[PDB]
Write a protein that binds this ligand. Structure first.
Ligand SMILES: [Mn+2]
Ligand SMILES: [Mn+2]
Length: 181
């Protein structure tokens, strides 16, 4: 049974723009995708989830994820100046203009409730909303408020499922699942 390479998978599976933004995120952190390739895949996956989440409701969200860090903070600080939002301690992923809050999107291969609790412990915010997806359909969100409707979230979950089945098909899932954290 053949075992594919994760780089081949990422470049074949993810949109060119997503791959390029992921390369940029890794460079900005000085990470080498040729060595940390499971991480490369996880970054692309996280980017794509953030984009799908925003696209579920045109106009509602500002995207923070994907931007260079300096531009990301520029955008965050502008949103805070404009809307009166409290400045987050860590860069979030989106800003929700309807619910008036920043959102941290988590995508995990670990148990979603534990991942959620860890995220919540890290950001130290009474305000930032957290929404966690797993690759097998489970999710967890702040105050049991899932923000988007069932169809939109199903679209995201189906995508995560497809990625996982594609990986497994190439023998890449075992390592990807086990490599997190
Ligand atoms: Mn982020
Ligand atoms: Mn995130």
């Amino acid at each position: 049974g053949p075992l594919g390479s994760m780089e081949d998978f990422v470049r074949q599976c993810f949109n060119p723009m997503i791959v390029e933004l992921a390369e940029k995120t890794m460079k900005e952190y000085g990470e080498d995708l040729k060595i940390e390739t499971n991480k490369f895949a996880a970054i692309c996956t996280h980017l794509e989830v953030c984009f799908m989440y925003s696209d579920a409701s045109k106009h509602r969200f500002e995207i923070i994820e994907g931007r260079d860090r300096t531009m990301a903070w520029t955008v965050v600080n502008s949103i805070c100046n404009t809307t009166g939002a409290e400045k987050p301690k860590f860069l979030p992923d989106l800003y929700d203009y309807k619910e008036n809050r920043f959102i941290e999107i988590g995508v995990t291969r670990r148990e979603v409730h534990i991942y959620y609790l860890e995220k919540a412990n890290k950001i130290k915010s009474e305000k930032t909303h957290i929404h966690i997806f797993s690759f097998t359909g489970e999710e967890m969100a702040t105050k049991a408020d899932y923000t988007l409707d069932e169809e939109s979230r199903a679209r995201i979950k189906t995508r995560l499922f497809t990625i996982r089945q594609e990986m497994a098909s190439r023998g890449l899932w075992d390592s990807f699942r086990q490599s997190e954290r």
